[PDB]
Subunit: 230 residues, 6 copies
């Protein structure tokens, strides 16, 4: 159907959970979904569709970086009529009060990428998570009573950032964590009148290096229950 | 105490409602606050402090534009130890599905200003409303059962914008409304580890010109009840 | 007539003196104008029209920051057919040879705002004071024999500037003082084939903190006599 | 050893061929390398190391987009002491005289990404392929007598580009093709005093949609023979 | 003494008239200066020093474009202790009310160059002519009673400008004429606490193609008399 | 024929060698060309046309800076139907391993100018030397067996650069040398479907100050022999 997806309209659920690691997407499908069926493996992206508590749900990799997820998210909303995309995964803590293993729900994401400026006449576009998705994630977190921090994220184009001062600047403004996709995903959902959100588990702290399964499994519970709520 | 405020630490409540029109700030104090006392009138900004349901609350003008509100908000958080600032007022609808008299609660605000780029190493800072404030405003709206749209706002530096295409672009990305302060307020609250939010009543639609009191009074109810919740 | 002005065409003189502080605009009207009449008080902006030496002249506030004065100046030139706008007020000295109480006449104004780039295809627009207005101000200064420094000003979007190095950089390039409106006013006057100028009294020095009435009154004399000359 | 590579120093040859599709990297290893051994599969990136004509050579995926390849290339040069990275793969033709199935060797690559500006003080960095690698690729092409076009490439951050006019602009300046990694790879090689190059087979034309194996196999021959020459 | 000047401190007068055409600088020296002596001809720049009405004055070419004049002007102020540089020459009319053969005195100059942003922390630097020089030029014009237009100029980096819309935009903002050096010269004079100005004769109109000696000679009279006044 | 060239179509050879110093262009014509005839001296640019080994070849100055060479190169390709332009001259070494008197052949050139961003929708244009010209220059160097370094150059708009850190940054990325024209020339050649290249002799090192004829003559040999090859 698309240059990066062999599936056809209908193969994907209206709600898709995405993570960077394709092998993680596979593990998520085998571990949390019932009757998971591989609907797309172009570039070994591991796109699966199954059910959770009887409801259709898909999980698929999205690569690393804004350019990668922008391709996948746009095709999903446009061609496969997906309605909600929830990014699930890991991130690097920024704020000094955020620690490894913490779970973070993004209200929005800043970025050092030029993509949003290109689509927004060189102005400041606020890459904002869909309010419904933020609410569903927070409520799921409250209902499951799992501690989660809600706040700004940052999507960097440079995992290895030459601008060593940025990290401290972001800590001063209290950015919670860094990843590489949210800032790109959110504006695309808006353009298609669809929804997007992001929830991550801190795998490390960038201002000082500091069980990882429990945190990851708790995050998956929140994302999954939230997907049902939506 | 400051170049723009004659009051001293303690004269302002920890929660301050702000609007552009100083005469509106005065009207709000006389109409909704009990025992309102003028605590600052430098530049006729009309800064009052009184109580609502027994709790201390201040209301004050903030001028028009990001540069103006940045001055007031920074002094309030820094010098007067204010904790929460809620911008209340009017805005221009962008989205075709948003209409005059509608009430909008900002999750965040985009901007064509350079202020956030200056404070954020020329990168994209997501001017995001404090999640607690967004929640308090939405809950107040739900409890009072007043219909309100939640979504992105846009703070323009140019009321009379030469870039006539921007309006349609924003409608495509579903920006809800335009005002001139939010994008500046939000990042300042973050820097001071404080809180900020914005709620407005659409006074007109910018893509087509289309009782105004009821809407304004309903908005004031939401802001006020939210202030108590916080 | 406009969203920020209740007056109608003809209520404003062709020459308008503007300052940020609305209460100062009121004081100027009562102190220097004869038969001053309030022609606009939307947002308590204090717009007055009277006469000086028999000639019609208006005085009105313009708020703080480029976005604010851009609104007022554009409406005045466009709707009220005003021909000349002279910004009168205070500023912060930059240059080491400029001192508090000094009077400065701007030849032009630099800025860290994005407004001029937006209206000038992202190029460098030289926010220049109208040569006629600069001349009228200097001649008035010479005729009244009041010492005044003529040179570049800087209109900042950030009263509290995070870029602490800018101040010293501007001192090296000999910027005379900082305010928050000129860079916005000048290009608007050009667009409407009208005129604009700026004259200020240094209320403080930003590189080192260092009677204020005499200086302010002397500045008002220059502006007023210049207004007559024009 | 690294967050994206489980291999240790020595597992990778000093020359690494990279492509976006991990499944293609696997196919290349099984088809052209002798005794190929999987040295890294973190994120299913398919990193293999074997020999070609007796010389050690590695092949591995690099994901889509500059942020992705920047991670992989920097770790390879820095941690695994790789000396030469040759990007092999597909691209979209831009120039009207370039056609589907054509083989293109990049002298350099332009981009709409902000990465190079971030690492080069906001100036214009010329993402240039290592001259040795360009020469090796061209000579291999000449020796194998396989027609190949040499010229500028373009690495876009947006596969689905909102700026529809860019394509025609690039055709006027004669950019040969578009991909999503070269502009990022080249500057990284320079920083590490290492080498990088790119060769692609046009899978389609972006200005008009227009056997694919022969072209791909011919490209692989050039890259492989060039790798030996280096 | 410098890479572009073989003269030594003292060979140049404190006032230097500069034009792009080296052959014009030579003609000016032979035609208006008494006892003109060649003090520098590196790169055939034709730097002369003589006297006008008994006062020392130099004339020299400066090449075309901001980068060229920046080299010459900086060396002159820094090494040769020159105090005033007056650019004399030709320009292209922009404004519809400006015509070929008209004489224009620049109050300032806009530009599409990046030089001023590089020296001014990426902000808007107002390339302003020294007020003393503008005054001297205008007074000379008034005393000689030669009609001259005073206003903004524009220094383009592109004689052949791809942005065909810029011309009309500048006409709307009433830029008087275009040349290629002023925007660079003015900020350099400021940095060295020196002076600079520009006066040109329109050789053609860029919005519509439309004796040339009289205009040029009249301009030279103004510049020369102004040089004496300074 | 053009505002900067009095010659007519046919007066210039299809191959033109250009240098900044007009007196050097004259010396090159008298020293290496047979029957050199002055075909253009507007602005004393010294444009000559003669023959080398029987083939028509022109040499002419181009001034200093991108704006200057852009004028000359565009007129030459457009009006005089020139096919190949080779910039010959001097440059300042950047890389620590490059020394004074070394000969450098540019594969491409970076820049701090805004010209390429203006012509390339504000994106990163890779100012690349024509591959044919790079090859001809390298082969000539190999055939004459003259040691020459091939790599990136940098065209600065500021000979006297305020950004003192740039030099070290460029050394880290291994830029070979700095000049002031290449970045402008290369994109123009592309637009006209023509060719351009650059070869220079290091006259000094910018990171530490460190016979000059031999190097210059060797460079001229390479350029000349290359011109014949093309
Ligand atoms: N500390 C960290 N920093 C950055 F920039 N990204 C982090 C991260 N931890 C996880 N991620 C997520 C985002 C990318 O897809 C991928 C990068 O390894 O995994
Ligand atoms: N349609 C509209 N457009 C913009 F730009 N701002 C609007 C508005 N309606 C209200 N506002 C708010 C924001 C400023 O403080 C002030 C500007 O009049 O009131
Ligand atoms: N030191 C100073 N710095 C800045 F930025 N602005 C100054 C000032 N002194 C006076 N002003 C003028 C301009 C604004 O309207 C307002 C800001 O208080 O008053
Ligand atoms: N027409 C085309 N346009 C763009 F932008 N990239 C193209 C392409 N054909 C192949 N590619 C390469 C680059 C990415 O890794 C990936 C994107 O599908 O494959
Ligand atoms: N119409 C025109 N446009 C531009 F851009 N520059 C003009 C000009 N007429 C004269 N000049 C001056 C400036 C350069 O030094 C040189 C360019 O030919 O002469
Ligand atoms: N060290 C150096 N730095 C820079 F920026 N340019 C250099 C140079 N050596 C020679 N050039 C060439 C380029 C200009 O045309 C002219 C500048 O003098 O000569």
């Amino acid at each position: 159907a698309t240059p990066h997806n062999s599936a056809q309209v209908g193969d994907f659920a209206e709600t898709v959970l995405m993570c960077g690691d394709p092998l993680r997407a596979k593990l998520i499908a085998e571990t949390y979904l019932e009757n998971p069926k591989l609907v797309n493996n172009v570039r070994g992206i591991q796109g699966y569709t199954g059910t959770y508590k009887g409801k259709p749900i898909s999980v698929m990799g999205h690569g690393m970086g804004l350019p990668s997820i922008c391709i996948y998210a746009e095709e999903l909303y446009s061609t496969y009529k997906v309605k909600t995309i929830i990014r699930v995964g890991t991130c690097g803590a920024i704020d000094m009060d955020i620690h490894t293993r913490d779970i973070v729900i993004f209200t929005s994401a800043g970025t050092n990428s030029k993509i949003n400026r290109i689509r927004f006449m060189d102005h400041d576009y606020p890459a904002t998570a869909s309010f419904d998705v933020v609410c569903a994630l927070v409520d799921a977190a409250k209902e499951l009573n799992i501690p989660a921090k809600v706040g700004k994220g940052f999507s960097t184009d440079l995992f290895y950032n030459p601008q060593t001062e940025l990290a401290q600047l972001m800590n001063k403004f209290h950015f919670l964590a860094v990843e590489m996709e949210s800032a790109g995903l959110f504006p695309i959902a808006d353009l298609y009148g669809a929804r997007a959100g992001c929830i991550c588990t801190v795998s490390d702290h960038i201002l000082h290096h500091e069980e990882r399964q429990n945190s990851f499994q708790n995050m998956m519970k929140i994302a999954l229950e939230a997907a049902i709520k939506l």
